[PDB]
């Protein structure tokens, strides 16, 4: 996925070119500038769109692999990250409504925090396999609790502010031009009325509403299909 | 009311419509995952779908991987995939892969009872986009699962279904349909043309 | 010919004291099919009305379960046991209120039957009427001083089985009629938790 699958995040890519893309074109500056090892980058805030397409778009423009963690069962991934010199690690399946009590996010995310603590302590140990990066952003401050388990290190702090629907309308057109879509779709209530704990549920209403566009013989996507899919995901959420 | 709907769509909605999945906007999935430890299943739906729609049905046996050390699985089911997509439109059922787990025109239904040893490499989305949870048949599924078997067998007005919907809900057991097949094996005794409660209770206490 | 005896297949098809392999006389089948002239002929000769078979199926269980009002009136006229014990200990009133037969319920209850008669399952017919959603049968059972908190073999009350069927009218009605929402079962679940 290239930059054509994202829109409205010029500040995040402009700021991420030096956090990530700086040692790509000219790695030689890592001895004259004395910059610290770029131990990944984290984000915080409800991810509307761009949670995975950021590591996949920057990893795509880096021409590197995209490995996913998903005995200890984490050493072999570092062995593959050793044979393959570049690697980008990102996690999913956690961007749900469960990331609101901080108990399952703090424990289940704390295990991955220990995993990246021993892996980044192997990067701090030796640099045989450079350009290893991790990105953590689930929904909210819980990532700042991951920063509570990883304080004052080289990790970078980047916030995702949606000014007004500019990360939902144009990206709904980009993520929706595959199938048919209506022009005057009102995303104000049906897109602002699901903030906070669940940001991926917008795309969940997109795909799960497309299921009702298939079974309901609807050629295009309407407003009552998203309105019904919001309730259908809110019975389980 | 969503299991037979998802199996309906992703299994038996494109009747001979090979191009439908080739020109629908939303990418059609191929794998449908079923679960639920209490409800056994894995036979009533394979035979039910295997008898409702007029098509080919070639199921696979779970244990043929000893020779290849859990590697023969994907080769066998992949051969069934290629012969099913090259042959007439068929449906393929996958059963008991927990031991080995340690624009498409194929139909992949998957039912099991263990999700702990499943490697997340297969459960990755794209292929297994739907994970249906099938619990033990409740009172509604017992009225339907008993009506669908007594509709062809013998019955009388004396035989009430309120104790046959109340008691099987109390005894949380598996393969109740096969227990009704045993009730038919005791109803073919020819001693009575119409089956009575003595054969149902006798089959409930003996087998 | 569901039976072996000629008088049982013919008494069933509309035509005595002797038994068969099923230990059931011709009165069970004659009351089953609902032939008034044949049950009045066999009972006119003087056949016993409470011939219990090997299981215990009395002719009133099958006559009341079959929904034959005239046969129930004939067996009540002859003085049949309104609380006989069958194989599963159920009484003929459980089959009267089971098949949603209001006539047999008012007739069997008019004679002085027992609604709270504990069967072998330790349950009443309110688990059945509430199992299929028969509010009128439950209400006419309440007209005859019937309990609404009979603990089943699992410990569930009729309100638990009424809420399990998603009968909101029967749920809130039985709540507004005297059913206790505090009686706990073996599952330790309240009647409000079972409903959705």
Q: Is B94 helix (H, G, I), strand (E, B) or coil?
A: strand
Alpha helices in chain C (DSSP H): 6-12, 26-33, 36-45, 59-65, 69-78, 92-96, 102-110, 126-132, 135-142, 158-164, 168-175, 191-194
For A205, phi then psi, to 5°, come to -75, -25
* Cβ contact C159:C124 at 8 Å: no
- N-to-C CA span, chain A: 29
**Torsions phi, psi for A89 (to 5 deg):** -110, 130
CA distance A215 to A110: 41
Collapsed DSSP state (helix, strand, coil) of residue C82: coil
Q: Which of C126, A191, C53 is nearest to B158 (CA)?
A: C53
Whether A215 and B5 lie within 8 Å, measured CB to CB:
yes
C2 vs B192: CB contact, 8 Å cut-off?
yes
Considering just the CA atoms, what is the radius of gyration of chain A in Å? 19
List the structure tokens of A28: 């030689």
* Window C:61-100, CB contacts with B under 8 Å: 62, 65-67, 87-88, 95, 98-99
Q: Are B167 and B31 in contact (CB under 8 A)?
A: no
Selection from B199, B118, B115, B125 nearest residue B156 by Cα: B199
Tell me which of C2, C20, C163, C165 to substitute to probe the interface with B (most B C-beta atoms closer than 10 Å).
C2
Q: What is the spatial distance between Cα A92 and Cα A113, in angstroms, rounded to a whole number?
A: 14
Torsion of CA B48, B51, B55, B56, to 10 degrees: 80
Distance CA B120, CA B123 (A): 5
Q: What is the DSSP string of A126-192?
A: --SS--EEEE---SSTHHHHHTTSS-SSS--EEE----SSTTTHHHHHHTTTTS---SS---HHHHH
Residue A88 CA from chain centroid, whole number: 12
Hey, which residues does B93 pair with through a beta bridge?
B109
**Which SS3 state, helix, strand or coil, does residue A193 take?**
coil
Contact B33, B101 (CB under 8 A): no
- How far is B111 from B34, CA to CA, in rounded Å? 4
Q: Which residues of B47-82 are buried (b: 16+ CB within 10 A; e: fewer)?
A: eebbeeeebeeeebeeeebeeeeeeebeeebeebbe
Q: Can you tell me the distance from the alpha carbon of A135 to that of A40, in angstroms, rounded to the nearest whole number?
A: 6
DSSP codes joined into one string, A95-138:
-STTTTSSHHHHHHHHHHHHHHHHHHHHHHH--SS--EEEE---
Residue with tokens 């200990």: C89
Find out whether A91 and A68 touch, Cβ atoms under 8 Å: yes
Chain breaks in chain C (C to N over 2.5 A) after: 15
CB B34 within 8 A of CB B41: yes
**How many CB atoms within 10 Å of residue A165?**
16
Residues forming a β-bridge with C81: none
Alpha helices by DSSP H, listed for B53-94, are: 72-86
Contacts of B32 in chain A (CB under 8 A): none
- The Cβ of residue B166 has, within 10 Å, a number of other Cβ atoms equal to 20
**How many beta carbons lie within 10 A of that of residue C167, not counting itself?**
20
Residue in B59, B53, B45 with CA at minimum distance from that of residue B15: B53
What's the half-sphere exposure (Cβ side, CA atoms, 13 Å) at C33? Answer: 18
Find the CB nearest C32 among B158, B167, B198.
Answer: B158
B86 three-class SS? helix
Report the DSSP pairing between strands A132-135 and B90-95. Answer: unpaired
CB C66 within 8 A of CB B157: yes
Give one word for C145, left, alpha or beta, with left for phi > 0 and alpha for psi -120 to 50: left
Q: How was this structure determined?
A: cryo-EM
Q: Are B30 and B106 in contact (CB under 8 A)?
A: yes
Burial class (CB in 10 A: 0-12, 13-18, 19+), A36: exposed
A141 contacts A180 by C-beta, under 8 angstroms: no
Mention every residue, 6+ apart, whose C-beta is less than 8 A from residue B104.
Answer: B21, B28, B30
- Choose, out of B25, B26, B120, B126, the residue to mutate when testing the contact with A (most A CBs < 10 Å): B25
Tokens of C4: 């072996």
Q: Are C101 and C66 in contact (CB under 8 A)?
A: no
Location of structure tokens 């073919």: B188
Mutation pick from C132, C150, C185 vs chain B, by most beta carbons of B within 10 Å, is: C132
The number of beta carbons lying within 10 Å of the beta carbon of residue A183 is 6
- Measure the CA–CA gap between A191 and B83, rounded to whole angstroms: 46
Strand partners, B110: B33, B94
C-alpha of C19 from chain center: 24
Q: How many CB atoms lie within 10 A of CB C127?
A: 22
CA dist C7 and C30 (Å) reads: 10
Dihedral over Cα of C17, C23, C26, C31: its sign: positive
Long-range contacts of residues C28-32, Cβ cutoff 8 Å, at least 24 apart: C28/C53, C28/C57, C28/C59, C28/C62, C29/C2, C29/C3, C31/C59, C31/C60, C31/C62, C31/C63, C31/C66, C31/C68, C31/C71, C31/C75, C32/B156, C32/B157, C32/B158, C32/C62, C32/C63, C32/C66
Taking CA atoms, A94 is separated from A91, A114, A236, in Å, by 8, 17, 15
The closest alpha carbon to A39, from A152, A189, A170, belongs to A152
- Alpha helices, DSSP H only, in C13-134? 26-33, 36-45, 59-65, 69-78, 92-96, 102-110, 126-132
Residue of C nearest to B190 (CA): C2
Number of neighbouring beta carbons within 10 Å of residue C163 = 27
Give the distance, in angstroms, between the CA of residue B189 and the centroid of all CA atoms in the same chain.
29
Single out the residue of C52, C38, C36, C37 nearest to residue C9, CA to CA: C38
Rounded Cα distance, A78 and A82, in Å: 6
Name, in order, each residue with C-beta under 8 angstroms of A202's C-beta and a sequence gap of 6 or more: A48, A49, A168, A191, A194
Place of tokens 């991951």: A146
Cα distance between residue A175 and residue A46, in whole Å? 18
How far apart are alpha carbons B85 and B94 in whole angstroms? Answer: 16
Q: Which of B90, B94, B100 is nearest to B127 (CA)?
A: B94
Residue A89: enclosing H or E segment and its boundaries? strand A87-90
Structure tokens at B200: 């149902």
Give the separation between CA B157 and CA C95, rounded to whole angstroms: 12
For residue A135, count other CB atoms closer than 10 A to its CB. Answer: 23
Tell the residue number behind the tokens 């239904």, with chain if given. B109
In angstroms, the CA C94 to CA C116 distance is: 10
**What pairing do the DSSP bridges indicate for beta strands A87-90 and B130-133?**
unpaired
- Supply the DSSP string of B118-131, one letter for each residue: --TTTSSTTTS-EE
Are C1 and B163 an interchain contact pair (Cβ–Cβ within 8 Å)? no
How many angstroms separate the Cα of A91 from the Cα of each of A27, A66, A124, A138, B144?
27, 11, 22, 9, 43
* CB–CB contact B26 A215 (8 Å): no
Residue among C123, C73, C119, C126 at smallest CA distance from C97: C126
Query: Does residue A66 contact residue A59 with C-beta atoms inside 8 Å?
Result: yes
Q: Check if the beta carbon of residue B95 is closer than 8 Å to that of residue B112.
A: yes
* Residue numbering of the annotated binding site of B for ATP: 36-43
Exposure of B127 in the CB half-sphere (CA atoms within 13 A): 9
| Separation of CA B72 from chain center | 23
End-to-end CA distance of chain B: 31
Q: Tell me how far apart the alpha carbons of residues A59 and A63 are, in angstroms, rounded to a whole number.
A: 6
Residues 129-188 of A with CB under 8 A from B: 178-180
Is A125 exposed, middle or buried, given 0-12, 13-18 or 19+ CB atoms closer than 10 A? exposed
- As given in the structure block, the two tokens for residue A225 are 């299909």
Return the structure tokens found at A183. Answer: 């022009």
C-alpha–C-alpha distance, residues C132 and C29, integer Å: 27
Q: How far apart are CA B5 and CA B37, in angstroms?
A: 21
Burial class (CB in 10 A: 0-12, 13-18, 19+), B123: middle
Handedness of CA A178, A184, A190, A193 (dihedral sign): positive
Q: Nearest Cβ partner of C127 from B160, B166, B192?
A: B166
Distances (CA, A) of A63 to A25, A71, B65, C185: 12, 31, 38, 62
CA distance C183 to A183: 57
Q: What is the resolution of this structure in A?
A: 8.3
How many CB atoms are located within 10 Å of the residue C18 CB?
Answer: 10
What single-letter DSSP state applies at residue B109? Answer: E
Cα–Cα distance for residue pair C117/C95, rounded to 1 Å: 13
**Whole-number Å distance between alpha carbons of A39 and A147:** 13
- Asked whether the beta carbons of residue C98 and residue B160 sit closer than 8 angstroms, the reply is yes
Residue B131 and residue B112 in contact, taking contact as beta carbons nearer than 8 Å: no
Q: Check: CB of residue C71 under 8 Å from CB of residue C102.
A: no
Chain A touches chain C, with at least 3 Cβ pairs below 8 Å, answer: no
Count other C-beta atoms under 10 Å from residue A149's C-beta.
13
Count the neighbouring beta carbons within 10 Å of the beta carbon of residue C87: 15
Query: A123, A117, A102, A115: which is closest to A70 by C-alpha?
Result: A115
Q: What size, in residues, is chain A?
A: 237
- What is the Cα B152 distance to its own chain's centre? 20
């Amino acid at each position: 996925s290239t930059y054509e699958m994202i829109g409205g995040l010029d500040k995040q890519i402009k700021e991420i070119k030096e956090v990530i893309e700086l040692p790509v074109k000219h790695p030689e500056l890592f001895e004259a500038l004395g910059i610290a090892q770029p131990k990944g980058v984290l984000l915080y805030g409800p991810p509307g769109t761009g949670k995975t397409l950021l590591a996949r778009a920057v990893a795509h423009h880096t021409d590197c692999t995209f490995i996913r963690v998903s005995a200890r069962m984490v050493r072999e991934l570092f062995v593959m990250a050793r044979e393959h010199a570049p690697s980008i690690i990102f996690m999913d399946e956690i961007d749900s409504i469960g990331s609101s009590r901080l108990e399952g996010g703090s424990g289940g995310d704390s295990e991955v925090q220990r995993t990246m603590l021993e892996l980044l302590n192997q990067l701090d140990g030796f640099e045989a396999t450079k350009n290893i990066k991790v990105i953590m952003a689930t929904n909210r401050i819980d990532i700042l609790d991951s920063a509570l388990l990883r304080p004052g290190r080289i990790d970078r702090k980047i916030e995702f502010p949606p000014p007004n629907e500019e990360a939902r309308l144009d990206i709904l057109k980009i993520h929706s031009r595959k199938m048919n879509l209506t022009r005057g779709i009102n995303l104000r209530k049906i897109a602002e009325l699901m903030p906070g704990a669940s940001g991926a549920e917008v795309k969940g209403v997109c795909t799960e509403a497309g299921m009702y566009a298939l079974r309901e013989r609807r050629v295009h996507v309407t407003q009552e299909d998203f309105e019904m899919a919001v309730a259908k995901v809110m019975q389980k959420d | 009311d969503i299991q037979k709907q998802e199996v309906r769509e992703a299994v038996e909605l494109p009747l001979t419509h090979f191009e439908l999945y080739k020109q629908i906007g939303i990418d059609p999935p191929r794998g449908v995952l079923m679960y639920g430890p209490p409800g056994c299943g894995k036979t009533m739906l394979a035979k039910a779908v295997a008898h409702h729609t007029t098509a080919a049905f070639i199921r696979v046996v779970g244990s043929e991987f000893v020779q290849k050390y859990l590697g023969e699985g994907p080769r066998m089911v992949r051969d069934v995939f290629r012969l099913a997509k090259e042959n007439a439109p068929a449906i393929i059922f996958i059963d008991e892969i927990d031991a080995i787990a340690t624009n498409v025109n194929v139909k992949v239904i998957m039912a099991t009872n263990r999700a702990d040893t499943l490697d997340p490499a297969l459960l990755r989305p794209g292929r297994l986009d739907r994970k249906i949870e099938f619990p033990l048949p409740d009172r509604r599924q017992k009225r339907l699962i008993f009506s669908t078997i007594t509709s062809k067998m013998n019955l009388s007005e004396e035989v009430d279904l309120e104790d046959y919907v109340a008691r099987p809900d109390k005894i949380s057991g598996a393969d109740i349909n096969s227990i009704c097949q045993e009730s038919g094996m005791l109803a073919v005794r020819e001693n009575r043309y119409i089956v009575l409660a003595k054969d149902f209770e006798k089959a409930y206490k003996t087998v | 010919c569901v039976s072996n005896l000629m008088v049982c297949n013919l008494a069933y098809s509309g035509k005595a004291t002797r038994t068969d392999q099923d230990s059931r006389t011709a009165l069970h089948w004659a009351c089953s099919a609902g032939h008034t002239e044949i049950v009045e002929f066999l009972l006119q000769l003087g056949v016993p009305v409470n011939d219990k078979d090997d299981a215990g199926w009395s002719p009133l269980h099958i006559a009341a379960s079959a929904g034959r009002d005239e046969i129930v009136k004939a067996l009540l006229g002859k003085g049949a046991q309104v609380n006989a014990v069958n194989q599963n200990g159920c009484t003929p009133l459980h089959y009267a209120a089971s098949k949603n037969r209001h006539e047999i319920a008012v007739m069997l209850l008019e004679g002085g039957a027992n609604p709270d008669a504990k069967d072998h399952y330790e349950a009443t017919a309110m688990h059945r009427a509430a199992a299929k959603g028969n509010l009128k049968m439950i209400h006419i059972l309440l007209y005859y001083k019937a309990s609404t908190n009979i603990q089943d073999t699992e410990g569930n009350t009729p309100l638990h089985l009424a809420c399990d069927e998603e009968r909101v009218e029967e749920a809130k009605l039985l709540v507004s009629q005297g059913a206790s929402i505090y009686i706990e079962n073996k599952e330790e679940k309240t009647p409000l938790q079972v409903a959705k």
